[PDB]
Structure formats: C-alpha cells, structure tokens
C-alpha cells in the first residue's frame, strides 16, 4: 500500500458490467497497490430512494457480495456501511457553510441527473446537495486518491475546493484528493444508450447466468441499415465493439472484426457470438466465487461488519481533528 | 415537567433586554411547568459565522451565563451545546431528503434574512437548509411544545410537515411539535429602530452596569417633534414608552404617564428618569446573579456539561427509533 483511495457505490441493486470495467476491476489492482476503502453509499442512497428504505437495506449486502466475487479481498479492502459512520454527516454540515447554493446550482453532473428525473424546481435538499456529501466521504476517510469517471469530475473538484477552503479557514487538517483518469469512458448500455444500469433495464448483472449474459448480447443494439450479413456494417454507435474494446484481451483480434465488420463478411452474429464468451470468459470467476460466498454469507456480514468498525475508527479521528481545528466549544 | 418544551439562541454575543423581553422571562415562566430544554446553537451559529469560529465558541459560555443571570434554573432547566451531540447532524442530513430545494426556498423569514444579509445568490448552502437541522433539533429533543414569534413559525410549520411526512413514510416515531405561539412584539432599539441589536449599536446588554443602563436611556430616541418639555410629545413610535409597556409593574404609572406627556410639560428626562428606575428593578437581580456567577466559572460549565450529557441521552434515544424506522442496515 501506499495512497488512501476512497471508491464506491449507492445501493440500489446488484452490480453489472458496467460498473466492472467502470472500477471494480480497477480496485482490484489497486487493492494491493494502496490502501483501499469501498463505501456503500447508504446514505447518498436515500436522497434518491428515501421513499424505498427496504430497497437499500437489501442492497448493501448485495452489493457487498458483488465486490467480494469481483474480486475484491477482505484482507486488503475496508469496507465501509455510510449509515453507520455518522461521523460523515458531521463532517457534511460543516461542509455545507463551505459553498453557495448558486456553485450548487452550476455543478453540470447534478444538473443533469436532475433534469432527468423530472424534478425541476422540486428536487430533494438531500439531493441537490449530495456532492459535498460525496466530499465530506473523501476528506473524513482522509483519501488523497479518488478514481474518477470523466462525469464525477466536477465533484471531485468540489472536493478540494471545499477543503482548500476549510484549511485555510480552520486550520490545515484535511487532505486535498487527486483525480484517478480512466480510460475505457462509461460503458454504455445494450440498449445502445451511454449509461447502462438496472433503472434503464438495459444491464447484465454480475450475477446473471451463462443463459443470460448470453441472451442479453443477442438482443442488443447493433446497427440499424446493416439488416443482412452481406453487408457493410460500421463500428460507430455499435455497443458490441465498445463491449469488446473493453472486456476483450486481444486489441489485434478485435481491430480484425473491426475491418470485416466495415467490409462485409462479418455477421453481427459472428461479432455477438464472439464476445458472448469474451465475457463468460471475464466472468465464469467470478460466478464461482460468489458461490462459495452465497454458502458462506457469514462471511459477507463480516466483511461488512469489520471494515464498518476500521472505516469509523479513521473517520472518528479525523473529526476529532476537524473539530479542534474549528474551535468547537470542548476542544 | 409534562410537556416537552424546546428553545434556544444562536451563540453570536451577549443577551440583551430585547431577548429578556421576548423570550427569557418566558423561559423562566416555562421551567416551572413544563420539562425545558435550551439549546446554545453553535452549530446553526456557524451557517453565516463560519468565517468567525472564535466568536462563536466564546458565545456558548456567555450565552450561558447570560441565561443563569437571567433567572434559568440550573436544577430545572437542561442547557445543551448543539455541537456536542452529533445526533443532530446525522439526522438532519436524512431530514434533507424529505424537504424540497423550491420549498426551502419558500420560507419568507430565510428569505427575509438573505435579502437583510445580501448574500444574492451567494447563500452559503449551510445557512439555505437551516431550517430543516432546527427540524432535526426539534424532533431529536423529542419536543412537543416550541416557543415561537410569528416570525419563527415557518419554521415550525416546517418541522410539521418534515415530521410528518417522516412518520408516514417510515414509521409513526416522531412527536408533532405544537407553536406556543408569540411574546406580543419585539423590543425596538434604544434609537427607535424596529430591531434592538449589538450590531447596530442600540442595545442594552443584561450583563451592563447599574450605570451603562442609566446612560443609555437617557441617549434614547423620543420624538422627533418634541423639542422641550412645555411641548406635547407622542407616544407612539417613541421606544421609551414601548420599553415601559414590557416591563413597567404598574401600567396605571404608565397609563398616567402617557396621559401627562401628549399633555405637554412632561420632559423626556422626568419619563426617562422612571424608566430607568424600572429597568434597575428588573435588572439589579439579574446583575447580581450574574456576577456571582462570574465567581463561580465551574457552576457555569457545570449548567451546560451536564444539560448536554443529558441531551446527548435523549438525542441517542431518539435516533435509535430513528434508525430503526428508516430500516437502516444493522437496525
Ligand atoms: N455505465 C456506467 N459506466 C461506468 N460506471 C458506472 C456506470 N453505471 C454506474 N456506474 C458506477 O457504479 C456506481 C454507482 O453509481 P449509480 O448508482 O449512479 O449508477 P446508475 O447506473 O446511474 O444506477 P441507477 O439509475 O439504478 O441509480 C458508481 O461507482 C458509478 O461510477
Ligand atoms: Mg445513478
């Protein structure tokens, strides 16, 4: 180890692929390369699903299960439950003196998840304000490394402004993040859309079947105008080959499918059948592990359980010194 | 000690006889017949001091003292520091999620103080939702009665609805608290002008001497138009009868008073001169509780630790009901 690296996700069901190649697999060599901390967003969770508890509840677990079977080591890996480090909603209050509502406002990320869910002026506080939520998870885990899709930038600039601000305020306690660029950008979905997720229905799931995964290239978006073999087809816009291009090991073989494919004997079929087993292939691990896992789901809550305890224990003293660093009656 | 009851003051600088006026001598009524708790608000403070941490810590001590001066009840009243249990914190963030941005934007007194501040649209983010982490004092206190001036009942109103809709969305766990409605108006400055304030410069703080009170009711706006005593002077707008109507024991003096200055003869120094006889009878003991209290530094420290320690209990309580309600992991 060596950097503290804060990564993580909202509970809101099972992890697909677009979530691997987006970072589950980056954690995973990160995993011995630095100190790695996975926050399940429970909190964050609810300024989206604060009206489905349940949902969440049942998603922690879930998802916990999905890291552990990406790969992920509870000998090596902090795992760490939102909800039950309060020291992070502590540390969000006093944050939020730290910005404007109209900064709030001009964040593009949010803005569009906004316009999206149809909220308009009636968005949540809770939401609106989730990024320097996000901040008060980076600066109270201490980490100085947060890998980052080119869309979560501006939070994470948001970040270390925010703590820039509180250094020189307060006193110079909190550590300003850096960015970790990916290269693969968000893996779209087989719908054909940019994002893939279990809400746009358009994802495979790390827990579907060899059945599945299968049926689920088969119906995805290829290339309307290419409607028999024959003809030429064009990689632009076709999911497949940015499916390949980010689960498939042989760059050679997939620029080859790449010429075919332009020429005109190369059927999208041949292309799906192809990177159907690309993908077993990336995945036929990590359904085995996740088996033995199932059987062991004690061994789940405890992976929960123990990094939960670690998470605070780093979180309660950072605290510690962003409260005496504030001068709040006491210390 | 039946009924709940929650107050507070926002740790900024002195009492003065504005806030004795419209609160405390309420506040000593209430210790008697209901179960009161007083919250030093150093967090909420820090919405619009976040700049000025230093002014706010000090505040809680002399806030506090200033309380004891004026007559609370360190054997019947639980004086709690705001920053000292995070349980508020932490349920203020879940309260963000049940209240909307445009509805926050609503409240007519956040709306009124902006405009007062001029912060534009430069609102920093912690003083738009302080609203919502009142609601959360309120609710985590368990209170069910809240001393409240027309101006604070959107605020109130708001912790009824956030309450509200907590309990049907989750479970029934939450007290719906209930106005106690006015303190007939606020005390206007030593100049006239509508608001009594350090910051302005026309106040009487409780904590000034026998000597400051005589002088600065002698320097007391009157009436523009009475220019010697022969002349008849007005009553209305003229603080040094709105000062006699809060605290004059004996309205037929008042009543003669008034009558003998629309008359004409009765100068500001024979009006002024008995006002400041019945601000030293309703001061004197005040200041000498006050300074005996000065003697004794650990009594006040005693008042506030302990009132916490047993705010920080029922706080810990409540968000225990809380969490389970919300169906949070582990709960
Ligand atoms: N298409 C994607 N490409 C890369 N990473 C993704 C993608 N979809 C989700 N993630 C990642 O998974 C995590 C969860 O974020 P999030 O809950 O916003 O995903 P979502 O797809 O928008 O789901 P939903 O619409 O069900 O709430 C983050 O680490 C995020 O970067
Ligand atoms: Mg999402």
Redesign the interface.
């Given at each position: 180890a060596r950097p503290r690296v804060l990564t993580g996700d909202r509970p809101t069901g099972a992890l697909h692929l677009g979530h691997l190649a987006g970072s589950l697999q980056n954690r995973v060599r990160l995993q011995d390369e630095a100190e790695l901390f996975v926050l399940?967003a429970?909190?964050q969770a609810?300024?989206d699903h604060?009206?489905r508890?349940?949902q969440?509840?049942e998603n922690?677990?879930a998802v916990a299960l999905d890291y552990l079977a990406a790969g992920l080591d509870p000998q090596k890996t902090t795992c760490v439950?939102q909800?039950?480090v309060?020291?992070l909603?502590?540390l969000?209050?006093?944050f939020?003196?730290?910005?404007?509502?109209?900064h709030?406002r001009q964040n593009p990320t949010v803005k569009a998840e906004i316009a999206q869910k149809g909220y308009?002026?009636?968005?949540?506080?809770?939401?609106?304000?989730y990024p320097?939520?996000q901040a008060a998870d980076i600066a109270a885990f201490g980490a100085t490394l947060v890998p980052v899709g080119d869309d979560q930038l501006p939070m994470l600039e948001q970040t270390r402004e925010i703590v820039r601000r509180f250094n020189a305020?307060?006193a110079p306690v909190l550590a300003e993040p850096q960015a970790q660029l990916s290269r693969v950008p968000r893996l779209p979905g087989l719908d054909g859309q940019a994002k893939m997720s279990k809400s746009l229905g358009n994802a495979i799931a790390l827990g579907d079947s060899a059945d599945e995964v299968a049926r689920k290239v088969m119906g995805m978006y290829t290339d309307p105008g290419h409607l028999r073999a024959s003809d030429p087809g064009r990689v632009e816009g076709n999911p497949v080959f940015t499916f390949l291009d980010a689960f498939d090991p042989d760059p050679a073989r997939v620029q080859a499918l790449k010429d075919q494919y332009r020429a005109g004997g190369l059927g999208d079929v041949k292309v799906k059948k192809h990177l159907i087993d690309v993908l077993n292939g990336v995945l036929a691990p990590i359904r085995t592990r996740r088996a033995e896992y199932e059987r062991d789901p004690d061994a789940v809550l405890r992976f929960?359980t123990e990094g939960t305890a670690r998470g605070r224990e780093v979180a309660a003293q950072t605290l510690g010194q962003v409260?005496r660093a504030?001068?709040?009656?006491?210390h």
């Open positions: 399940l429970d909190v609810l300024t604060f009206d508890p349940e969440v509840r922690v677990l439950v909800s039950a309060p020291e909603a502590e969000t209050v006093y939020l003196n730290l910005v404007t509502v109209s709030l308009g002026e009636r968005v949540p506080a809770g939401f609106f304000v320097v939520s305020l307060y929960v409260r504030m001068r709040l009656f006491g």
